[model samples]
Structure formats: structure tokens, C-alpha cells
Target: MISGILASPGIAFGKALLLKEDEIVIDRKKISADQVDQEVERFLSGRAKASAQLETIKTKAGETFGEEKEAIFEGHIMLLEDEELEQEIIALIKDKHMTADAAAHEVIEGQASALEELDDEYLKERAADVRDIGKRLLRNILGLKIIDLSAIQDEVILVAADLTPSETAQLNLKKVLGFITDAGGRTSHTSIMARSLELPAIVGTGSVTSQVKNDDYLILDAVNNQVYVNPTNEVIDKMRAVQEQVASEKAELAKLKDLPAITLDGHQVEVCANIGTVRDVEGAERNGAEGVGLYRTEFLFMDRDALPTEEEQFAAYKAVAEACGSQAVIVRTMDIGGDKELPYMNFPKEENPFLGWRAIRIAMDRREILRDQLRAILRASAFGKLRIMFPMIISVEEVRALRKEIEIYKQELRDEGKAFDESIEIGVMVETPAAATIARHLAKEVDFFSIGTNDLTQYTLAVDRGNDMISHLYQPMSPSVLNLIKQVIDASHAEGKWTGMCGELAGDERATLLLLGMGLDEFSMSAISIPRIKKIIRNTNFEDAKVLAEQALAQPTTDELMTLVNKFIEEKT
Candidate 1:
């Protein structure tokens, strides 16, 4: 039995199909001045081909997996079309007299190496995406077959080094029982994709790709904490029975779809979605989400050759606003920086991106970009209960600066006699330890608060969530982390403002009840996690949950805190 991080949940029994990583070998050649023009044309043609291919993948992934998946392809297109890279390679080819492949390889490696230097594992892994795009461009320039993972003839478990967005988008899921990876972080892009697909997957399994043979029967016991390789028929039958039981449990959970997310003793809780694109609106509705708790506006700026126009942002925001109707729709302003980047934008490399110039820092410096988004959001506010949120804020001055910008935009809208909700509420995301410390001042300035636990856990614990070495230290259940959450909630409520959480912990069943008791009024997460969290809310006694929250507060270890939550779940069961 091999232990691994459970990327997604379920049970599966199948034969293993090992997939080796593809290595791209580029041969650099010096070109004559006469050949420079031809090399440049070759680069342009390659860019065009890569764009067309990505467009195709975007359309297909959107149809099959929805917009988030579609946006994956959008990023690739942006990188292809980014003039920074285009100009970089063209300059090398035209001035240095280098071949197209050499120029492209040189430029791509520099960027990937820069990404590797940043103290962000997610960004470091994104070097793969950069390499993938570069490889595709080189392949287009120099004839080479693209790697395809589709066309499996029989049911099997995928064993791979990792799955890229393109490979995942093109996957034929009908033949896949599950997947195992030799490497991936807990929050790796590949691991997140597995969760989105709802496949029973086990990642971070060190060397399982080499350990399992092609014909070996595998038991992916994600819930039971082990993988059974070459298991006997008796063990396989036993796991199959467990699979049936798990499916039946999901069936019972589905019956609560239309039910209100209210506690047993009459306390109400809000269940909402954390979206990135308009297509995510459809998913939220399908999963019985009350509203969008966090709509990340970064996708509009991520992969495109230029900034998204106000009209384009207006249309997207309006679509989501109207979808939620009266439900509270919280739109976070463009929170770019750290691992999340835009190729077209100019930003000096930072050693620690998480603590660098990002989110509201960018907003304060780039008011025009911030103004354009505020204008677009106001134009869409007519459709629903749309609220504005700012991320990466550590001070009330940041809140005040954003407030001044909002006021200016509102005046501009009023002068033009536009239709926008004047009564829309405003909020701030408390993710920084500094912000949590000064939550009282911010609470009075805003109408609500949303704890971004992903960042909060990392900042409060002073550990990078992406580092595999200290990944164990990045615990949300840490006493410091939980206390900070409680501090923010208390501060928000002291001003009569509601507090919500839009983090991984928000969707966790064990964490859900404790947060409920700790005064979290809203829970926003993935569409798939909605109904399950709602079911927990509907059955939990708010008063007992309060007791559980207190018990967890005094615990010195995660084991103790986890045991407290486990006992609560057991009693409810």
C-alpha cells in the first residue's frame, strides 16, 4: 500500500497505463543575415499556428468542461500573442542572426528560469506551461508530432509525470477509471484539474509511475489512505463494494439540492460560488449556489495580448450578475501578481511574490486599470446584488485609497446618467496577518469581510503552501491560523458587518461546522462542493457547533483540533 495525497475522492480498480514525460530537444543554429527574414517569418507563422490551435482547444474545453477550462487555453494564446515575447525572439533572429528555434528556445528558457527563482511553487510549476508553449511553437516551426493522450482502447488508470492543460482538455474521460501522478503539489494546477474532473485521483505518489507495471491491477483508495498495487481479486471485490457505498452516499447528499442552507436551530448560512469566468455562473446555478462569493477578475487580463476593454468586462460581469439575480455577487478586483501574471504587463521580478507588489498594491499604482474595472462593475451592478472586494490589503489606507477611486467612478457614472446600483455593498478580503490585526478599522470602512484562507494560512504560518518540504507546516488548522480567522470575524461583527470565507477551508466538511460556529456568515467554494457543505449546514446545531469551535480553539496540535472536528462529524453521522 502506497500513501499519497488524495487529489479527488472516489474508489477505482483498473490496470495501470504509464505515461512518460516528453522531452523537447532543440538544436540551435546560427543563421546568415540573408536568412534572418525567413527565420522571422517562420516565427510569425509559428505564432499564428499556435494561436489557432489554442483557439480550437479553448472551444472544445469550454464545451466539455466549462469556461475555467476554456480560460486555460486563453492564457496560452495570450503568451503566443504577447509582443514582449514576440519582439524578444524577433530581435534575436533579426539582430543576432540566429535560427527561429534557437531564438525561441533562448527566450523561453530565460523566462522559465526567472519563474523558477521566485519563492512560489505554483509559479515554478507554471514554467512547465511556458515550456509547453515554447515546445509547441518550436514544433510548429520544425515539423514534429504533438503528444496526444486520447484514444485509449480500454478502461485503465493513467500513470503520468503530470498532465498539462492541453493534455487534460483533450482527454477521453470515458475510458479513464482514475489517474496517478509521480509528482504534483497539493495545490498544483494538474492536481486541481483532477478535482475539477471529479476523477478518483492520487497525486504526489513518489515514483508510482515506475513501481506499477502495465498489467497490474490498482486500487486507488484515496479515502483509506493507501494505494493497493497488484491487488488480489478478493481485495478488488472489497474495494468495489466500498465504491458502491460511496456512490449511494452521494445520491443521498444530492437529495438536499433545493433545501435552504439553514442550521437545525434556525441559524441561516449563505452558500455561494467562487468563480473566475462567466461560464462559472452556469456551474454555480447547476450546483444550487445562492450567489457568487468571489469572482476573480484576473482572467480578463491574464492571457490576452492587451487589457480587457470596459465594455467587454461589463458584458461578462453583467452576465454573472444577472445569473445570480438577488443572490450576493462579490467581484474581487484584478488580483494579479505573484504566480498569477500577465505577459503584456511590465513587472520587475520579485524574490517573494506573495509579499510583493500585487493585488491592491497594483490597484493603487495603476489607477487607470483599477478605474476601468470599477466602471465596468458599476455598469453591471444594475443586474444583481453585486458587491466589490479588494484583495491583498494590509491596511485601512489601502481601503481608503480604493474607496476614493470608487467614489470618483461613481461620480463619473452619475454625470453620464448611467444605470448602476448606488446601494451596492463594499468589502475587503482579510488574507494578510497585518490586515487581520487591524480588522477593526477596516470593518467600519467596509460592509463585509471575506477570509481568503489559502493566502491567510500561508501568511499567518509564514510558510509557502507550494513548498513540498514545508507543506505540512501550511496547515489551516494551526492555532495561529484559526485564531486570526476568529479575530477577523469578531472585528467585522463588532461593526455589525457580516463575515464570509472564500477558501479551501470553506468547502471542507470538518472545517465548515467550526467556521459556522466562529461566526462565518457565508461559505463560497467550488460548484461541486456546494451541496455537500449546504447539507452539513442544514443538519448542524449552531449551538453545538459553537461548542466545537471553542474546543478547537484551545487545542495545541492539529491532531487535537482534527479529533475535535472528527467527533463532531461522527455525532452528526
Candidate 2:
């Protein structure tokens, strides 16, 4: 059994279909000096053919997945026509006496490596685009089958090292039972598409591609985030039964669409969603999200060569606000850097990115960027309830400075005769131990507090959760972390402000009761998780939850805390 991140929820049994890139061997033999012009022509023609093929793919993608995927291919076309890259390849062929294939290989791979080594997630992912285009160019020159995903004639579970955006766009869903990849996260394009297609998908299974051969039987249990290879008939029957149960459970969850998240003893809390784009609003609403708890605005700045215009930002924010209606949308300002950065904005690479310039730090330095986004968010507030929150804050001074900027923007909007919510709420994300420790001080400034436990846990433990070797130590359930959470909640309540959690822990069913007991006013997570968490909340007695939380916080170790939670759930639910 392979455990992986559940990218999409479903169950399937099928043969494994491994998608492997065909090796296109390049001839490194030097071209004759007299043949340089002919080689250059061949290279140019192949580049043209690749661009033409991408154009066709781009149109097909536009028809199927809409403009986002189409824009990805359009970016690829632009990269293919990059003047600097063209010159670099031509130089290698003309001056270095290199063959066209070898020159193209060297130049393209060099560029891709440079991108891969960048201090940004979007740009690093773009490295795959460069490599994908290189493969297309090489195949055009060599007249090979330019990748064959459409050739599958039978149902199978796809296993691959990774699936690029183009390959994922070309997937024939009718014949694809499910897919498990050696790389990808819940937010990757492939994962997002898997959910849209309603396919069972488990990505980031480190060695699934090498472990499974073509035609090997596979059982994909995406709901449980596991895959079983060649399981016995007994196990298969068990999984089939569980699959039926899952289908019924989904139907039951759908019935919760209009239900409120209120405890049996009359305590109520908001169940919201953390969204990155406007398109996510539909899913959040479908899952009965009461509001948008965390709108990660960094996505608007990523996957492009330049910053988004103020008007572009305004349109997106407005669309989301209009769709959400009465639901309050908490718009988190651009949390760029750490792992995400803009391609055009060249930030200095840091040895410790997590501790370096990011979130509000970057916003303070680049005041214009911050001003543009604030102006847009303020403009969008006129359509619906929109609250602004600054991320990665630690001190009272930063909040004061940020408030000053907000006032300046408010004055500018007034000068321009634009309408906005005069009493729009402001909040801060408490993702640092420093913020959590000074919760009382911060509560005096911000209107509310939203705990980002993903960062809070990592920073509190001094562990990089991405580091495989020490990830086990990155426990959000640690007694100290729980204490901090309680302190923040208590502080907010004392200040007559609400406290919410918008992190991985917010979605975790085991932590739901404990958080509620800690007086958390809101729980925001992935849309898919809202239903289950709400069900728990509706069934729970607030007083009982408080007792359970007290027991949990007193436990010294994470194991003891988890065990206590299990016992409580077993007895209560």
C-alpha cells in the first residue's frame, strides 16, 4: 500500500498504465562549418512546427478547460519564440560547431535548470514547461511520435513521475479510471483537473512509477489516500464495499448544503473555506461555506512574467465578492516570497527563505505593490462583504503601519469618488509564535484573528515541514502549540473579537472538537472538508467539547493527545 496526498476522492480498480517519456538520443557530432546555415534552418523550422502544434493544443485546451490552461500553452508559445533563447541556440550551432539537436538540447536544458533553481514555486514549476517544449521541439526535428496519451484504448490507472499541464490537458477521461503520480500536491494543475473530472487521484507517491509496471493491477482508494498494488480478492471486496459507503456518505454530505454549523447546546461557529481564486467560490458555496476565511491573493501574482494590474486584481476580487453575497470574504494580502515569488520581481535569494522577506515584509518594502492591491480590495468591498488581513505579522508596530497605508488608500478612493465599505473589518494572520505570544497586544489592533497553523506549527517547532527527515517533529497537536492556540483564542474573545483557524489543522476532524472547545469562532479549510467538520460540530455538545479540550491540552505528548481525542470521538460520535 502506498500512502499519498489525496488529490481527488473516488475509488477504482484497473491495470496500471505507466507513462514514460521516450528517450530521444541527440547526436553530439560537430556539424561542418559550411553546413551551419542549413542546420540553423532546420532548427528554426522545428521551432516553428512546435509552436504550431502548441497553438492547436492551446485551442483544444481553451475549449475543454477554459482560458487558464490555454494561457499556459500560450506562454509556452512565447517561450518558444524567445529572442534570447533563439540567439543562444543559434550561437551554439554557428560558433561552437554543434549539431542543431545538441545545440537546442544544451540551450533549453540550461534555461530550464536556471528556472528550477529559482526561489519561487511558480517559476520552479515553469521549469517543467521549458523541458516539455524542448521535448516537443526535439520530436519535431527527429519526426518521433510527439507524445501519445491519446493512444490508450483500454481503462487503466495512470502512474507517472509527473504529468505536465499539456499532458494532463490531453488526458482521455473516458478511458482513465484514475491516476497516481510520483510527484504533485493537492493544488497542482493535475490534481485540480482530477477533482473536476471526478477521478480517483493520489499524487506525491514517491516511487509509485518505478514500483508498478504496465498491466499491474491497482486499487486506488483516494478517499483514504492510499493505493494497494495487486491486492487479494478479499481485500478488493472490502474496498468495493467501502467505495459504496463513500458514495452514500457523499450524498448525505450534500444534504448539508444549507445547514448551519451549530453545536447541540446552542453554541455556533462559522464553517468557511480557504480559497486562492475566484473559481473556488462555487465549490466553497456548494459545500455550505459560511464565508471565505482566507483568500490567498498571492496566486494572482504567480505563473506570469509581470505583476497583475490594479484593474485586473479589482475585477477578480469583485467577482468573488458578488458571488459570495452575504458571506464575508477575508482577503489576505499577497503572501509572496518564502516559496512563492514573481518572475519579473527578482528578489534576492536567501539561505533561509521561510525566515526572510515574505508576506507583510515584502508589502512594506514595495509600498506601491501593496497600495495597488489595497486599492483594488477596497474597490471590491462595495459589491459585498470584504475584509482585509495581512499575513506573517508579529508586532503591533507593523499593524499600525499597515493601518496607516489603509487610511491613505481610503482617502485616495474618496478623492476618486469610488464607493467602499466604510466599516470593513481588518484582521491579522497569527502564523508565528511571536504573534501568538503577543496575541493580547495584536487583539487591540486587528478586528479579528485567524490562526494559520501550517506556519505556526512549523515556526513553533523550528522544523521545516518540507524536510522529510524532521517532518515528524512538525506536530500541530503539541501541547505548547495547543496552549498558544488557546491563548490567542482567549485574547481575541477578551477583546470582543472573533478567532478562526485557516490551516491544515482546521480541516482535520480530530482537531475540530478541541479547537471548538478552545473558543475558536470559525473553522476554514478546503471546501471538501467543510461538510464533515460541520457534521461533527452539529452533533457535538459545546460543554462536552470543552471538557474534551481541557483533557487534550493537559496531555504532555502528541501521542497522548491523539489517543485522548480518539477515545473522546469513539464515546461521543
Candidate 3:
């Protein structure tokens, strides 16, 4: 068996595969654009027929599952009805006099080219979503199934260059044992879907698709980041043992579902979940979250062509708070900008999105947008314990200016006699090195502080994670990042205010132990990952965690820091 690690922008996992050395040559002959165009026309004709068949299913869904379920089917119909996109394909056919397949390919490439020129990563990722949808629609019309895995009866590890969201969704989970892809990242829809389905997957395995052939015996170990193919008897036995160990650990973790996250030294920490929508709040409560640590309100405004109204924002926030009951909801007001772009907003493209206008920086400039959001949040405060936290806060001046703006809105609301919460506590997300370094100064002004280690680490290391070449330097365990976090934690404690971490690092099992040791009062992660993190937190004492933290902080190199963490977890287990 050959084993390897999957490294992507968002996640890292192990992959193991059994391999057959036989090479399969891929057809690389270029087909004319005219040929592709003809294929597209033929495909569209077939789609018109399929749409008729789908109408029956749509009608059944509307009758049985209601309009909400039917709306999903309607979305598919709308895609087929997209005259602008279809016109563009038709234009490509006429311009090039291409075949149906070539025209389809050209349309997909043209749309992708436009999206690639966009400065926003979120929008850029949407290009993949669009192309995947378009490709699938075309394929369905062509009466083609990309993979005929229907013939395979045994548990099979699916290997591919890349899997789009639609393709991943259509996968037969009952037979597909695991997944390995040559292209994709942690934030890619494929990885997100894999995690949602509880399927073991490894992505960004460079040329991984070429490493194995069809019908190869495979063993994928996601925990260790290994992919073994056609392994010897001895290696297979070892892998089996490792798999049993993982299963045992998972079983033990399952028993701690109802348990609180208490350290060995008797320190009780609140384990919360980061939520983006009202639906997410339900998942958080189901997973035993004490509260919602980070309610990302931007998702409501983003991915849409228009801005969300105040009533829309208020209703969404109210629904989330109502779902969480008495649990505190830390609503982060509009963290848009930076790498995130709003189609409705006209902003100049920036070279360094992370450092440019984002979070509070952008909100401060757009006062009208900011006031509308804060007003909605205040209105929702009456329904539950709602706290407002600003993101990308860099200076005391910005905080003071923001507070003044809030006071102005409060007076306006009062003059109009609008019912709202005026005494809502306000906090700031310590994401930048500037914020962390000046935490002591900022702590005295804000009611609370939430260390956003994801951005803090990125900024401290001066590494743009989106850039592949330097992403290797994006280390969370860097001494500088650790020290900055410690500074913020100590500053918050000095001011008698509790600090929380609501970042990807906060939810990471390995990183959680270190943060707890650093004296953080709260850890927020995804709802699904929270139960497992709580189990790990319950296993270690605060003092031991502190020692681990100290050891980790003292280390200069990333390798040493990781080594200390691994050793600490090993000894504790």
C-alpha cells in the first residue's frame, strides 16, 4: 500500500490506496470547436425532452414536499431557461460555426474566463459552481453518465482529477468507500460536501489521479494523511490495526456527547459553534453548543445580486436567536469586503484584499450600510441575548468612531420611538497583528474580545493563503502567531473580560488543546466538529495544556511546534 497526505488550501487529510501499476492512456486528440457546437445543439434538444419528464417530478414534489422542495427543482428549470447563457452559447456556435460539443466547451470556458478575472475569491469559486452546473446540464442532454460505476458491486475508492458539487452530490455513498482528487481545496464544494456526508476524502493530491489505475485495491487513511495502493500483506495488516484504533477513538468520543468541556485542572470553558444561518443554529444546539460564538451575518447579503433589506436581516437574526433559546449569540456585523465581494456594491479592485478595506474598515466607509445592519441587530436583541462584534478592527480611533456612529443611530431610533435594545454589549474581533498587539489598549474600550486566529495568523505571518507558492508558510503554530494570541488572551484577562476564538483553528482538535492552555475562555468551531473537540478538551488538564502551550510558543520553527503538539497529545492519550 502507498500512503500520502492531501494538502489543499482549506483542509489536509490522509489518503491510502491499493494500486495496480498498469498505465491507462488518456485520449488527448483535439476535437474541432464545430464538432463541440453540433453536440451542444443535439444535447439541448434532448434536454427539452428531459425537462418535460422533470415537470412531473416537480409537480409531485410541490404536492408532497410543498413549494420549498419544489423551488429546488424550479432552480434547475431556471438554469435551463437562462436565455443570456444560452444566447452566449448560440453566439459562440455562430461565431465559430463550431460543433455542439465545441460550442458547449467554449461557453463553459468563456464564463470561466470572466469569473477568473474577478478579484474576489468567493466569486471566483462560483465560477467552478457555474461550470459544473452547465457541464452537467449539457451531459444530461447528451445522454451520458460521466462515470458508469453502476457496474461495480464492491466497495470502491473513487479516484478523479476533480469532482464538482453536482458530481459529488450524485455519488452513490452506499458503494463508494472514499474519495481522492487531483484538484480541489478544503473550501471547494467537493470537500465541504464530503465532510457533510461524513465521507473520508483527500483533495489537492497533485497528479494523484495518474498514480493509480482502474480496479486497484486501495486503503485510504485520512487520519494519517496517507493513500496506500496495492499494499503488501504486512502493510495491509498494519493499516487494519490503525483503522481499528481510529474506530475505537471515534467510539470513545461518541460517549462524551452530553459532557461539558472541562479541563483536567478543573477549568470549565464554553464550547460554542460558528453559525452562518438560522439552520446552522439548530445544528449547533443539536451538537450541544453552549451558544453561538460567531454568527456570520454576511452570508445573508452575499451570493445575491442585490443588497438585503433591514427587515430581512432582522428576521434572520431573530430566527437564529430564537432557535438557540437562552444561549448568547455573538452576531458579527457584515464581514464583507477583503476577498469577499458584493455584486451590488461598487468598490475598486484591490491588490491585497486582506489588508485593504474589509470588515470594520469597509463598514466604516459605508456608513449607511453599517447603520442599517447595526439597527437590525439591535432590533433582534429583544428576542434574545444578542451581542454585536465588529470585524477587521485595527485602531482605537476606528472603534471610537464606530461607537459614535452607533450612538447616533440609537438617538435616531429613540426619536422615532422604535423598540430596540440600546444596552447591547459590543466587542471586536482581534484578527490583525495590529489588533492583537494593541489588545490591552483596545480591551479597555470594548466589552469583550474574540480572537480570530485565522486572520491573525495569516496577517502575522504576512502570508496570503490564496497564493499557492507561499501558502506553505501559512502556519498557525508559528511562534509569532502564538505569542500574539497569548498577548490578546492576557490583555482580555487583565481587563476582566473573557476572550473567545472563533476561527478554523479554534475548531481544530490539535489547535484547541494549545488555545485552552493559552487560557482562552471559549472555543468555537463548526457544529459537527464540536463534539469531537469537546471530547479532546475533556481529556487534558489546563496546567498540562498550559505547559504544551508554553512549549509550543517557545518553538521557532513550524516543525518543532507541531512536534511538541503531537507529543503532548500522545502522552495525554
Q: Which candidate's lDDT is highest?
A: 2
Best-to-worst TM-score order? 3, 2, 1
The segments of candidate 2 whose C-alpha lies over 4 angstroms from its true place after superposition are 1-258
**Candidate 1: RMSD to truth:** 11.0
TM-scores, all models, native as reference: 0.58, 0.59, 0.60
The residue-by-residue lDDT of candidate 2 on 1-573, one tens digit each, is 567887777788899998767888988778898889999988878766876777887887778667767888878888788898888999988899898888888888898988888999988776877787887788888777654677788887788888888887677777888878867586566876676566678778888899889899988777677777888998798789879988987787555333458888889888899998877887897676888999999976673467877898899899889888878999999998777767688888988888889889987998888999999999999999999998999899999999999999999999999999999999999999999999999999999999999899989999886788998898898998999999999999999999999988889988999999888998999998998899899999999989989998899888999898888889987
Model 2 superposed RMSD (Cα): 9.7
Backbone clash count for every predicted candidate, in the order shown: 1, 0, 45
Global lDDT of each candidate = 0.83, 0.86, 0.75
Scored by lDDT, model 2 comes in at 0.86
**lDDT digits (tens) for residues 66-91 of candidate 1:** 77678878887887778898789889
Better model by lDDT: candidate 1 vs candidate 2: 2
lDDT of 3 at 276: 86
Model 3's TM-score against the true structure: 0.60
